[PDB]
């Protein structure tokens, strides 16, 4: 278990921007789907304010059965962090 402040409980575009860098490691359902399906996304839409919107539209387009995995993976991706990246702090 890590320390600090209870993981910010609030889904917002402010976070997506972050997960966008993790790509396939995106801890989000939508921010992840695009990262994979649309690898060159950034290219198509350089301006975040414009790209983020593309992540939503594309996400909604997909069917629940399609997000099924992209929905769980995002959650599991959050765990990998805590586990992996083994670090020792005094």
User: What is the rounded CA–CA span in Å between residue 38 and residue 57?
Assistant: 13
Distance CA 27, CA 85 (A): 16
Please list, residue by residue across 18-46, b when 16 or more beta carbons sit within 10 angstroms of its beta carbon and e when fewer do.
Answer: ebbeeeeebbbbbbbbbbeebeebeeebe
Residue 86 DSSP symbol = -
Let me know: does 70 contact 19? Beta carbons within 8 Å. Answer: no
Contact of 63 with 43, CB cutoff 8 Å = no
Q: Which of 15, 16, 46 is nearest to 33 (CA)?
A: 16
Which domains does the chain show, CATH number per domain?
1-90 (1.10.30.10)
3-class SS letters over 18-50: HHHHHHHHCCCCHHHHHHHHCCCHHHHCCCHHH
Query: How was this structure obtained?
Result: NMR
């Amino acid at each position: 278990g890590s320390s600090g402040s209870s993981g910010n409980a609030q889904r917002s575009t402010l976070k997506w921007e972050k997960e966008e860098a993790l790509g396939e490691m995106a801890t989000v359902a939508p921010v992840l789907y695009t990262n994979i399906n649309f690898p060159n996304l950034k290219e198509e839409f350089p301006d975040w304010t414009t790209r983020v919107k593309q992540i939503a539209k594309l996400w909604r387009k997909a069917s629940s059965q399609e997000r099924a995995p992209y929905v769980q993976k995002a959650r599991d991706n959050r765990a990998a962090l805590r586990i992996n990246k083994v670090q020792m702090s005094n």
